Design a protein around this ligand. Structure first.
Ligand SMILES: O=C(NCc1nc2ccccc2[nH]1)c1ccco1
Length: 165
């Protein structure tokens, strides 16, 4: 079960943790992946989660894309969580480095509401280029289900907690 999280709101919790190690320890029902529309898990959270599955996440994802085509920015799909979780919810937040619309971040977080409890990263943060403080704000104002946020970077985690309104 989830331990060492700081409570931000009634339903949002946060911890300075590597989401891969957190997923291997907790084996949650749902781990969220910071996916792209192609489910190409090359880097960031996606690359790390996929590497932890020995590439099984990428093999499953390529079969999913071959059958269904790409996801929408702001959309999601549920796939296996492999050795990390029961399920992986691949959520596509806007990548502002690729010029995608930041307003799609609320739509991306709305996917979390279909699951009672999730282990998740901050969407569009990291290599996706959005301001993580803004992502946490959108998360708390959009997600109503229980979300356990893992923030890899200690300095960012401290900035997120200390600046949380
Ligand atoms: O590959 C690993 N960590 C690197 C990593 N961890 C991230 C978390 C968020 C964003 C980028 C990251 N990149 C690993 C394997 C097992 C435990 O950790």
């Amino acid at each position: 079960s989830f331990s060492g999280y700081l409570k931000l709101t009634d339903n949002v919790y946060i911890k300075n943790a590597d989401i891969v190690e957190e997923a291997k320890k907790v084996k949650p029902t749902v781990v969220v992946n910071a996916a792209n529309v192609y489910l190409k898990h090359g880097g960031g959270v996606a690359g790390a989660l996929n590497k932890a599955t020995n590439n099984a996440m990428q093999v499953e994802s390529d079969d999913y894309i071959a059958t269904n085509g790409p996801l929408k920015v702001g959309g999601s799909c549920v796939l296996s969580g492999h050795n990390l979780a029961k399920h992986c919810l691949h959520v596509v937040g806007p990548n502002v480095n690729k010029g995608e619309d930041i307003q799609l971040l609320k739509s991306a977080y709305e996917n979390f509401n279909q699951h009672e409890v999730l282990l998740a990263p901050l969407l569009s943060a990291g290599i996706f280029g959005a301001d993580p403080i803004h992502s946490l704000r959108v998360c708390v104002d959009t997600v109503r289900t229980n979300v356990y946020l893992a923030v890899f970077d200690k300095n960012l985690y401290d900035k997120l907690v200390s600046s949380f309104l």
